[PDB]
Amino acid sequence: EIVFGVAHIYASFNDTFVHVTDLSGRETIARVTGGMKVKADRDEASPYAAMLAAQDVAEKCKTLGITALHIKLRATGGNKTKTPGPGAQSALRALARSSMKIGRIEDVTPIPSDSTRRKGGRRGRRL
RNA sequence: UUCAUUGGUUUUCAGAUCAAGAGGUAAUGAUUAAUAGAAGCAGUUUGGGGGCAUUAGUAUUACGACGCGAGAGGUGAAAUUCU
C-alpha cells in the first residue's frame, strides 16, 4: 500500500539536487537536478529551478509507484556553509504539493569535530 | 731588693702570665613567631598547567564496488578545471 523511498535534497549555493532513491540509498529513482533545467549557468540555484527539478521527480517516482518519501536536506556543509541555500524550501513545497504524502524531515548536512583548514587563507575572499 | 761587695743553697715576695678547685650562691645561660619568607602536612583539593603512553570523534581527500542519469565545480558574470 504505502511505500517509502527517500529524497536526499541537496540544496547549496549555486545548485540544488533532488535525488530520490531506495530505502537503502543505492538504486536511484529520478536522479535529476535543477541545474539541468535552466540554461544560464548562474540560474541553477533559483527557487524556480528547485521547483523545476521537483516538478519532474515527484511525478516520475509516481510512475515507479512511489507513494511516500522521507526528506534529507544537505547544506553543503563540509568545513563550508552548513546551511541549506535558497532552493531548499522551494523543493519541499514543490514536492509535497504534488500528492506525495510524506513524513520524515531530516537534515543530513555534515558537521565535523573541527576538521581541516577551509580555503581562502586567513584573510581570505577580500571583496 | 736586703744578705757592706757577690753568687752556690730557698723562701717571703710571688708586680706577673698562663693550668686551677668539685672557693659550682649562679633565675645559670637560646627575644617575638611579622596578615615577611621558605618548609611540612588524614590534608581537602582544584585546573584546555607540563611530558609520555592509550584511544576516540565526525569530516576531508583518495580508492573500491553498487545504482542512476549528464552535466558537475566556480563567479557579480565567465573561463581555466573535471565528466
Q: What DSSP letter does each residue of A62-74 carry, written as one string? A: HHTT--EEEEEE-
To one decimal place, what's the resolution in Å?
A: 3.5
For strand B, the positions having any atom within 7 A of a protein Cβ are 57-61, 66-79
- Written as nine digits, the cell of A18 is 533532488
Strand A16-17 and strand A10-11: the pairing is: antiparallel
* Experimental method, per PDB record: cryo-EM
Q: CA of A121 vs C1' of B25, distance in Å?
A: 97
Strand A68-73 and strand A16-17: the pairing is: unpaired
Of A104, A93, A111, A78, which Cα lies nearest the Cα of A12? A78
Query: Helix or strand or coil: residue A79?
Result: coil
- Using only C-alpha atoms, what is the Rg of chain A? 16
Shortest-distance nucleotide from A12 CA to C1': B73
Q: Which residue is listed with cell 504505502? A: A2
> A120 φ, ψ to 5°?
120, -40
Q: CA of A71 vs C1' of B17, distance in Å?
A: 120
Length, in residues, of chain A: 127
Of A26, A1, A30, which Cα lies nearest the Cα of A18? A30
